[PDB]
Structure formats: structure tokens, C-alpha cells
Amino acid sequence: EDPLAYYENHTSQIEIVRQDRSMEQIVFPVPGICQFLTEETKHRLFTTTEQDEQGSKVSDFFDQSSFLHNEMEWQRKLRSMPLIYWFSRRMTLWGSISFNLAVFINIIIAFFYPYMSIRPLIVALILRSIYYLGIGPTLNILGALNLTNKIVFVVSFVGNRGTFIRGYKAMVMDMEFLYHVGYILTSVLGLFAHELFYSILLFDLIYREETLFNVIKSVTRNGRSILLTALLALILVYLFSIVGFLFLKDDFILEVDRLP
Amino acid sequence: LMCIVTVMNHGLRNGGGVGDILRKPSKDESLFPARVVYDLLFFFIVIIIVLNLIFGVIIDTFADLRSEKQKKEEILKTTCFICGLERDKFDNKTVSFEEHIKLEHNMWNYLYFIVLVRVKNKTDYTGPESYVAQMIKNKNLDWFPRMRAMSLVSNEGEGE
Amino acid sequence: EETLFNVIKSVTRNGRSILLTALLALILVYLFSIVGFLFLKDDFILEVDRLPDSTERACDTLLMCIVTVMNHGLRNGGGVGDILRKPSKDESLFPARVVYDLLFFFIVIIIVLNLIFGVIIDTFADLRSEKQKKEEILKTTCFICGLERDKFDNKTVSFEEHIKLEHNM
Amino acid sequence: EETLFNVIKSVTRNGRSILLTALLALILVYLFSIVGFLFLKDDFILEVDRLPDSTERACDTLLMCIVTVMNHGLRNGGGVGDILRKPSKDESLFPARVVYDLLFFFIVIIIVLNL
Ligand SMILES: Nc1ncnc2c1ncn2[C@@H]1O[C@H](COP(=O)(O)OP(=O)(O)OP(=O)(O)O)[C@@H](O)[C@H]1O
Ligand SMILES: Nc1ncnc2c1ncn2[C@@H]1O[C@H](COP(=O)(O)OP(=O)(O)OP(=O)(O)O)[C@@H](O)[C@H]1O
Numbered sequence A: 001e002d003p004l005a006y007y008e009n010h011t012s013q014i015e016i017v018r019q020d021r022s023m024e025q026i027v028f029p030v031p032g033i034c035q036f037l038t039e040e041t042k043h044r045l046f047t048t049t050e051q052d053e054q055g056s057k058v059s060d061f062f063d064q065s066s067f068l069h070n071e072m073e074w075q076r077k078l079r080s081m082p083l084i085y086w087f088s089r090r091m092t093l094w095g096s097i098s099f100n101l102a103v104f105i106n107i108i109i110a111f112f113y114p115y116m117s118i119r120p121l122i123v124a125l126i127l128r129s130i131y132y133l134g135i136g137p138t139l140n141i142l143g144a145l146n147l148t149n150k151i152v153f154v155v156s157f158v159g160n161r162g163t164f165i166r167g168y169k170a171m172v173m174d175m176e177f178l179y180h181v182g183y184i185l186t187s188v189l190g191l192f193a194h195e196l197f198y199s200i201l202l203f204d205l206i207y208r209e210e211t212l213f214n215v216i217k218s219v220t221r222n223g224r225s226i227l228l229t230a231l232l233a234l235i236l237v238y239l240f241s242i243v244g245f246l247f248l249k250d251d252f253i254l255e256v257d258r259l260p
Numbered sequence B: 001l002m003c004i005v006t007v008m009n010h011g012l013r014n015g016g017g018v019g020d021i022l023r024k025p026s027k028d029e030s031l032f033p034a035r036v037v038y039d040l041l042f043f044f045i046v047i048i049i050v051l052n053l054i055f056g057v058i059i060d061t062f063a064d065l066r067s068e069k070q071k072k073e074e075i076l077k078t079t080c081f082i083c084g085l086e087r088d089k090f091d092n093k094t095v096s097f098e099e100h101i102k103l104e105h106n107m108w109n110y111l112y113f114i115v116l117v118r119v120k121n122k123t124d125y126t127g128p129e130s131y132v133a134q135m136i137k138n139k140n141l142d143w144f145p146r147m148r149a150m151s152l153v154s155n156e157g158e159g160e
Numbered sequence C: 001e002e003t004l005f006n007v008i009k010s011v012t013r014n015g016r017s018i019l020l021t022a023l024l025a026l027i028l029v030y031l032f033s034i035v036g037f038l039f040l041k042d043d044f045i046l047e048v049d050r051l052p053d054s055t056e057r058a059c060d061t062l063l064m065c066i067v068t069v070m071n072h073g074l075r076n077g078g079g080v081g082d083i084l085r086k087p088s089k090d091e092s093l094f095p096a097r098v099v100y101d102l103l104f105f106f107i108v109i110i111i112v113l114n115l116i117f118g119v120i121i122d123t124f125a126d127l128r129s130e131k132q133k134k135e136e137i138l139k140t141t142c143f144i145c146g147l148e149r150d151k152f153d154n155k156t157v158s159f160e161e162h163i164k165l166e167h168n169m
Numbered sequence D: 001e002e003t004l005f006n007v008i009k010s011v012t013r014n015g016r017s018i019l020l021t022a023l024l025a026l027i028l029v030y031l032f033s034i035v036g037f038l039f040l041k042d043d044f045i046l047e048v049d050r051l052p053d054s055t056e057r058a059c060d061t062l063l064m065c066i067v068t069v070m071n072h073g074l075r076n077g078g079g080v081g082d083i084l085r086k087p088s089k090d091e092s093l094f095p096a097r098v099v100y101d102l103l104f105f106f107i108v109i110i111i112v113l114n115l
């Protein structure tokens, strides 16, 4: 390529303040490893970082330097293996396929249970399979496909995120991994035990859409206040019940429909 | 126990409160005023002032979340990540805020320099590299610029 | 619990407004009762279950008509119109009944009772804003000299040291 | 009228959030319908006026149970509990019915529709 372009790409400049309170500009060559940083991690760090008591975000950025370095090390190692890199690159595709499959199986279950572009094409294929194979076999193939899709998604997730780099305790602690293993457990359990269990997978919608999660957060940040208010309502109901029972007991008459 | 269960279930769910389920009173009854007061008090306390406090909290949380989000995005898109300077200070100057956050104060360049210091051998350390390495070892974060930019102070050359 | 008390404070700081709004609702109910009693008195028919007839009239006197309207109109979602006898299309007073019911619903159930719940939300917002301002002042300025944290930036001594040794109240 | 358009804009700028909230309500209704159908299927009895019996069962199939729950539970102020048959005190499933009705009211009528 152009000789000046490569050297231009691998050069960076920064500004630092010395112990003498003077500012100095440092031009240095970018390390070869630094080229392997992921864009998703960059965006996550940029948005997630929060101001400290002094109002500067530098502290957290520095504290994350070691984790960032380890992540880039793992990214280079992953880039060494082509197959794993290809699997990791399609994390969004795997997740979208899994969610679409879950929606379709739930829809079919709701419509038929109990029984004896790309999206329209999948709809037509599902309809044809139902017409020929049947509702049962079609649900079976959809469940198996979802199972393999989710297992591949989990593998891609661990490879891309590299949460195992922190340690086994760290990966187990991560809530996302726990949610994903919950998903795989629910999928296998439904495929092998009962079809209705697929309904649980619909909760994945909350994870898929950010706006829905933000809406739910309104009734989650101050959940304690809501529970305490409910307890206050219960206490008032208890006092009202005492007052009624002591004085107005004959008026508490209800209608009941007795089954044969 | 059963009276409590009935009151809660059929009074919280019903719009009119517990009064609806109870038997309809008669005008020529001794307890009619008591029933009226009981029903009205229950409706005005447990259905209009208590259940409404469970929905007001949700609205308040919505407002708090919106305000927090707006403040966070404003800070993100107005100030600089590293030095914390504001966009207004850069107006009417040779260098704009866009250039400041792209080349002069690109935090990713700082991360690259930190990686270089960690990787580079101690024998090949330069002056600034050695100083930054010592500061990193000491854990001090003073070497990060804080509300100071060389471009802005460039106008101080005339004063000097 | 502090949070429960804070929640209750929403309906306590502006309690006077709530009581006055309730009085306004009572006045409107009183006027509606007068209008009904003067003109629509036969339609005020109620069902009663006598303990050991099943129908009675609850607008013979103004006091009872007011009581019935308030009790069975404020509690019911549809207003006073629900309790009254169902009118017939071939009736002279059908338009009057329609206007009466709709006006009562749109005045005393949608615009008055809603003003008793809007006050609570407004008080919640006021309390949140006041609390946020108080905590911000507490955690940003100095108790004694009242200086701000920003003035201490880019200096030898930080705000943390100022409020611990130099200006410890 | 400009003011009317401004008022309408309130339910248009964040329409996506409203639709997603409705979908969440639908999902919760679907789960509640599954729970009812699996366990409380006899209690799903509805009244019908036949044009020229007066009672019918509306939870024989999962699709119909979902339809009945959504239509007559979201519209009713008291939730799904109102439509279901009134339970008896001397019944084994009375606590289950109480918990079911209260949970539905406190989740899908007070916390979801309010969102
Ligand atoms: N200190 C900072 N303050 C504000 N925004 C910043 C700061 N550092 C980086 N950014 C922004 O974060 C993103 C990172 O910039 P970067 O140079 O990586 O962008 P890019 O266009 O993807 O890269 P490339 O240089 O390869 O074209 C850009 O939006 C940049 O404006
Ligand atoms: N003028 C002030 N402005 C702001 N905060 C203050 C001020 N004076 C005291 N404080 C804060 O009030 C608390 C009182 O400080 P104090 O020295 O008593 O803390 P301590 O750690 O419990 O004591 P000790 O010195 O025995 O460790 C601390 O949080 C201090 O930061």
C-alpha cells in the first residue's frame, strides 16, 4: 500500500501534564496489538462510564485498562482461529434467529394447542411443514433448531465477550451468562418434557428491546416504595375488616355458584 | 381471616370499593348512616388516596429516569471525556471542539499509550514515557489533563 | 420505614387542596341532586335487599337524594347515570337524561376526581425536586463557608481536604 | 387545529414504547391463560345470549382461553377474576383462585396498563 498511509495509521498523539504543571504533546507509534480492539467494547466503555465524586471519568477508564488489555489479548488469540472468529462475528444473527424461532413456536402453540424477505419465507416454510409434516413434527423441528441455534449463540457469546478471561467465578457471576443458561435449560426442558414451557422464552423480548426494559425500570428502581405502599393498603384493609366484623357482619353476604 | 380476604379481594379490585359487594341497605334502617360513612371512607382512603400512590410513584420514576438520561447524554455530547472541558470554551478559537476530541484529547490514544508503557521495555523508556510509567506505578492520576488544553492556552503566547 | 412516610407525605403536604377539591365535588353533587329532584325524581329508583318490596325510591327528600347521588355516583365508574332507571327511546325526557348523565360523568368523574389525583402527582414531583436540590447542596458546597466544589478544582488542596480539616464545622 | 395535533403528538413520539408495553401485556396474558387452562379450566365459564343454553365454556382450547382472558380481563376493572365463576369457601382451590385473581390484578391492571 501507500508507504505514508501505513505509518500515518499507526501513529498517535496525546497531551500530558508534567510534575512542573507544564503540558507536553507526545507522539508515539501505536502498538500492533492495539489494532485488535473491538468497536462494541469501545462503545460500551464510552457510554457506561460514570463520573466520580470529583466529576472526572478518568479514574474508571484507567481502572479498566488491565481488563481492556486482556480483552485485546483474547481477541488476537481468537483471530488466530478462523472458525471461532466466524462463529463470533454472527452473534447478532444467531440471537435474531433464536428469538424469531421462539416467537414462531409460541405462536403455533397458542393457535393450535392442544392438538392430536426472510421472514415471509420462513412463514411459508412453517405453513408448508405444518400442512405436510404436521403440527407436532413441525414443532419438534423448530424446537431442535432453536436448541442448536441457542447453543451456537452461547458459544459465540463466550468467544466474543471472553468473560472467562476474568475467571470461572467471574463468568459464573455474570448475570448474562446465568440468563443464557436459563434459556438453554428452558429450551431443552420444553423440547423434552412439555410444549407449554416455551412460553417462558417470550420473556426474552425484554432483553431484545431496550425501550421495553427502560419502561420496566420505572416500576423497578422504586420497587421498595411500591411494596411498602401495598403493605399500607393491606394494613388499612385489615383495620377495615376488623371494624366491619365487629359491627357490620350480617351485611357481608356474597353470591356463590356451586358446581354440580 | 375470611372477612379480610373478602374485603381485600372484592374491594381492591372493584372500582366502588367494598361497598359494592355488601348487601344494599334500606333507608328505614338504623345502620344506614354507618354503612354510608363506611363505604365512603373506604373509597376515599383505599381507592382514591392509596392505590393512586402506587401509580404516582411510577410517574415520578419516569420523570427521574428521563431527567437522569437527558443529563447524561448532555454531559456526554457537550464535554470532553478526558479533560472535562466544555464546548463553549472552544468557540471563537482556531481549533473547534470536534478536532479537540478527535486528535488532541482522544481517550483511545491515552489507552494506547498506557498499553505501550506496559509493553515497552524499561531500558528503552524515553523521558515522558518514564515519567508516565512512574506515575502509573505510584497510582497517581495527575498526568491526565484536567480542565486544561494547550490550544486554548496558545493565546497566552501574546501575553507571554 | 422512611420510604413509606415519604410516600404518605405526598398526600399530606397539600392536604388542604385535596379537602377543598372534595368540597367542590360535594357542591357539584349537591347542585346535581337539586336538579334531579326538581325534574327527574321518578327515575331515582334503587334496589334494596330486605333482611328477614325489592325496590324503593331514594329521592323523596333532598337530603336522601344528595346522599344517594354522592354515594352511588362517586363510587360508580359511570356516574349517577348507572343507578337511575334505564330510559326508553320513545320517552319525552330521554334527551334530558342523556345530557344529565353525560354532563355528570364529564364534570364530576373526569374533571373533578382527576384533580384529586393530579395533586398527588404534583406533590410527588415537588418533593423529588426539593430532595434532589437539598442533597446536591449538601454534597457539593461547604457547610460553613458555602463555597462550591468547582472553585477548588485545579488547586493544591481538594474539596475533600477542605471539608475535613480546614472547614470542619 | 395546532393544539389538537400537539396533544396527539404525546402518544405518537413514543409510540414504540406503547406498542412494546402492549406486547408485554399480551405476553403476561398468554402466561396467565396457560396457567389457568392447565389448572383452572372449569372455572372459565361465560354467559352467552343466543339469538333466535345461556352458559358456555371458553377455555376448552388455549387460543380461546387467551382470547377470553385478554378481552374480558383487560377491559374489566377487576381483571380476569370477575368473569370467572364465584368460588366457594369450602373449596380446595379457593386459595389458588384468590392468589390468581389478586396477582393478575396487581400485575396486568395496576402495573402494566399504568405503564
Ligand atoms: N475525549 C473524547 N471526548 C468526546 N468524544 C470522544 C472522545 N474520544 C473519542 N470520542 C468519540 O468517540 C468515538 C471514537 O473515535 P474514533 O477515532 O475511534 O472513531 P472512528 O471514526 O470509528 O475511527 P477511525 O479513526 O478509524 O475513523 C468518536 O465518536 C469520537 O468522536
Ligand atoms: N463543613 C463541612 N462540609 C461538608 N461536609 C462536612 C463538613 N464538616 C464535616 N463534614 C462531613 O461530615 C462528617 C463529619 O466528619 P468527621 O471528621 O466527624 O468524620 P469521621 O470519619 O466519622 O471522624 P474521625 O475523624 O473520628 O474519623 C464527614 O462526612 C465530613 O466529611
Ligand SMILES: [Zn+2]
Binding pocket: B080, B081, B082, B083, B084, B085, B100, B101, B105, B149
Ligand atoms: Zn479534552
Ligand SMILES: [Zn+2]
Binding pocket: C142, C143, C144, C145, C146, C147, C162, C163, C167
Ligand atoms: Zn468551607
